[PDB]
């Protein structure tokens, strides 16, 4: 009953939406993937390909978690995204801001685990030159952290989803892989993750 | 009124938009409608269409009544819906945010029945491949709770009504159907409930 | 000056911009009236009208009244409409959000006059396929309160005028009507008023 | 700097944007011009000409000064327009809401002393039927306070600029002119001032 | 952490983000490199440059240190840019409002430097009459503080990298400079410093 009220309360309290929520030296692991829908158009003379997807990610949130039997019933709680922290993830070859079509509320359990789950459309460059070939045009779409490096946010890849995409599409989906790299850049002193989905598509006939 | 002024005041003390106002044991029931107004636009190579709707949504929020001998003559109110926890309902395969064409206010009676009616304007993906044949093309058009299951929010269909669909259309209406589903997903132990509404349509002459 | 600074500080309080400003009983009487300046573009294949036009809407807040000698030389006030109680009027049949193209701000004198002036551009619904003949095409611009009825908010008409037309446009004006209606719907026991502007006009030539 | 933080905490003390700096019998002065950047489109059809353009606004507001003697070092501050009062200066007839180009602060020097200098890309309504001829196009871009009169707002002009005209344009600039204007309505005792530039260009052939 | 977030508050603290964070007749020095990704498109006819591009920008904010020891592990912080200053670089010759592709977070080190990478869409007024010629268009793209001399801030350049240029562009970059100017404008006593980034380039086949 009111307990969701009294507990959304105290989840607030000394709260700080701004800060990663590491606990000593230990990193958030962050969960990610990407499940393409729908291939909305390719841009040949600008190189560029326009796409709707679901990403998936989910991270432990210490912070975030309550004794169940203080709030009985309350498992769960739905929450704005404004209100906690989430993964500032950045499509690092997009050119232009993501849409996001869905609801800006995650799901977080009693143990702290949030699930943020938006399905988003963006356009990103790309060669598509091939989209008119039988080998097809190959797209990545490579996501990582804007500002959290490997020792604050661990970013790992969960199996992807090709099984939403639309059949009526004019772009027949040939593959999608997902692979997860790491490097140190000539800018920082630690090393950055960050998770890549290529995909290889055609046009139809 | 000095009467809703001060019922305005009660309405927002103690009072949190995101919390969900189930009550112990029982899911906020939400009613639902979908009237078709006009179909915009048919993009046949992406696979797109451009509906404007009449979305109608009604559920009962306990934290919301008021006894009507204390505030005389105040019988319902106007209220933004940013101050008013509102249903989490995702359009499942729109491919753009939506348009609220209206006002962003609802409807409140001294029981806690909020009614939220807004008028939209989105774009959907859909095979329009037939709109140019007798049958015509059919598009499905879902909606449900992206972050609430079957046991926190009960989606429930009201009637389907086309009698808004505007007459001077390139586009005729065949038929609107509609249905509810209750579907599970390899992940939570709850279902989902959402509500499919399937129209078709068909390039006129 | 200061004494527009003392007024701000009397008038804000206890001010609640999301009450409308009724008097038991008494609805809040709003005058309405539209004025076309440019019809843009018409759109014969999605069926819509595209518009430039300038509202004229006044009504009268009794919370913002004052005693001009206790406030010498202050007779109106420019405030801003996010801070004050505006008609939640909506256009029935536009498809789209209208754009103010001038400043959000009231007039409002001392005995609690309010005026809103707004330049709008918008596009709406409506069958423009006789744009190319003598006869011409007409459009209905509807207008009424969203959430309130007769019985709170009384719409009324002052009178219309085609002077502010540009004469360099590409369409003629044939014919024009504004007049108030009042009708039920089939939610509500009160009946509503709008106010409708038809517009015929064709293309010269 | 340390005076620079102070100056704003005094600063922001019993300051009201919204309250147009006015003394008994003393009209706030607001110097304007206008320096027409580039001619981005002319709209035949539609009857529309888009600019880019700078605006210059100066205007004391004697709210805003202070003693360097206390402030040492802080001759003038950079100011969010946000929160201190503009001019509430409109475009007669433009078609679109303005695109603000440049950081929208504003200089502010002890003696109270503001300087707005915004660039702006806008829509207006205009006769560019002439575009091809000899004789060019004519276009008058009108502004003026909206809801100040001339007792409250003296709208000055000072000496305008085409030195800023782009030389790669496929218009050539022809000549502008500016005016500055008093007029009343039917509405109010009190004269509007308003300021045009008129501006003739043609395509370059 | 618990350490990171007992740091925001601290920070936070009497800080001002509109006061640029001079000390004592030392202006801030703001670093400053741009990093270009993508031509995205030439319009011939209204003579515009549309491209994506990397900004690097840092400047020291002494408001913003804290002693590592005080505070252990917590060497950087990643903070939201609307709460704390930023220079108010301007792109002299946009046409468009900057379009920003990427989180607007901050980094800032003990020491308070910080560092703002945002990747940017935006149009430019550029003469691109030459882009299908042996020796290409060339474009100008010029920034720099809108309100802040060079007293006051003290823009300086870093090396512009080519190396993130996307190759399979149907423009091929001939060559990039870039230069520091100061300029006296007819107002103020002190200059304004600019940065100038000169881009050659021409279509390919
Ligand atoms: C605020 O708005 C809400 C939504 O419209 C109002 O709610 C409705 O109230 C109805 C009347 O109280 C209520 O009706 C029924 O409850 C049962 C149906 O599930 C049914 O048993 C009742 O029949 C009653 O039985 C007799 C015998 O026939 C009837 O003749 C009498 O009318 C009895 O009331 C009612 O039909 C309906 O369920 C409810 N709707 C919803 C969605 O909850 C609410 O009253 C408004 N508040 C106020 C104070 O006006
Ligand atoms: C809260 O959510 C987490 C994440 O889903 C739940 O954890 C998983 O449970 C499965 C099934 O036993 C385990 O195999 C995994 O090891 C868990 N995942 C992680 C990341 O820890 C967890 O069960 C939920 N907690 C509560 C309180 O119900
Ligand atoms: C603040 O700025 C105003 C505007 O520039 C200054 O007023 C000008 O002063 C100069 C001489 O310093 C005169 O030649 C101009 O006629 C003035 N302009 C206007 C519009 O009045 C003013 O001096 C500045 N204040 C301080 C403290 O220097
Ligand atoms: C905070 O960041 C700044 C910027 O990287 C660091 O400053 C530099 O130190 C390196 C060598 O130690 C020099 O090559 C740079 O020129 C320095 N930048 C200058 C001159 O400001 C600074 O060391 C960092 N602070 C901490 C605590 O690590
Ligand atoms: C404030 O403005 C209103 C409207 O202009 C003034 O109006 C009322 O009186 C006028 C004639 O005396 C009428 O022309 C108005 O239509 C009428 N309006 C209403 C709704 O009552 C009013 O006098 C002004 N108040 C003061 C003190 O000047
Ligand atoms: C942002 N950058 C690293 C930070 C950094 O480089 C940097 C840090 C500090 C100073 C100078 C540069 C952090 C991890 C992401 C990486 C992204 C890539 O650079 C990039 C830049 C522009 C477009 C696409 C990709
Ligand atoms: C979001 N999802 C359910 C939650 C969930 O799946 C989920 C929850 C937790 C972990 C992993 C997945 C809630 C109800 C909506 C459903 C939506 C569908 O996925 C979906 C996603 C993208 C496009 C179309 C459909
Ligand atoms: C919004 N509606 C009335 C309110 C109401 O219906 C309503 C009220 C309470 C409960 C359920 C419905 C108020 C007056 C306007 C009317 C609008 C028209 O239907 C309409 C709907 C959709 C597009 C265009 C026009
Ligand atoms: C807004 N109006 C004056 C006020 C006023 O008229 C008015 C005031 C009160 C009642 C009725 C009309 C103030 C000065 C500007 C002027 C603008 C012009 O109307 C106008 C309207 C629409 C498009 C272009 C121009
Ligand atoms: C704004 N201006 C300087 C100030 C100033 O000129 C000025 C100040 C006060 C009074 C009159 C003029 C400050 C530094 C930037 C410079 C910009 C340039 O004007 C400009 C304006 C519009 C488009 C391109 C360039
Ligand atoms: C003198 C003056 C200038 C500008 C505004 C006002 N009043 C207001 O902004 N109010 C907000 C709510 C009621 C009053 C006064």
Redesign the interface.
């Known amino acids: ?1 009111e307990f ?2 009294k507990l ?2 105290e989840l607030v309290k ?1 709260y ?1 939406p ?8 230990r990193p958030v692991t962050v969960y990610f993937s990407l499940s393409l ?2 291939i ?2 390719v841009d040949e ?4 390909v326009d796409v ?1 997807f679901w990403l998936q990610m989910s991270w432990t949130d210490h912070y975030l978690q309550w004794n169940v039997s203080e709030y009985p ?1 309350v498992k769960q709680v ?3 995204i404004s ?1 906690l922290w989430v993964p ?1 993830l ?1 499509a690092y070859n ?4 993501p ?5 800006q ?3 977080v359990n009693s143990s702290g685990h949030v699930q943020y ?1 938006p ?1 988003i ?1 963006q356009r990103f ?1 790309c ?1 598509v ?1 091939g989209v008119d070939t039988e080998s097809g045009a190959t797209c990545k779409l490579k996501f990582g952290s ?3 490096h490997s020792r604050e946010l661990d970013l790992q890849m969960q199996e992807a989803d090709i099984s939403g995409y ?1 059949p ?3 772009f027949e989906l040939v593959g999608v892989t997902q692979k997860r790299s790491e490097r140190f850049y000539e800018c920082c002193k630690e090393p950055y993750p960050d998770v890549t989905f290529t995909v290889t598509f055609r046009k139809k006939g």
Chains 1, 2, 3, 4, 5 share one sequence.
């Open positions: 009953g969701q009220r959304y309360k000394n700080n701004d800060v990663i929520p590491t606990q000593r030296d829908l729908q909305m158009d003379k600008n190189q560029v709707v019933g739905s929450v704005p209100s500032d950045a997009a050119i232009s801001k849409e996001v079509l869905t609801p509320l995650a799901l789950l399905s459309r460059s060669d030159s804007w500002t959290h639309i009526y599409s004019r």
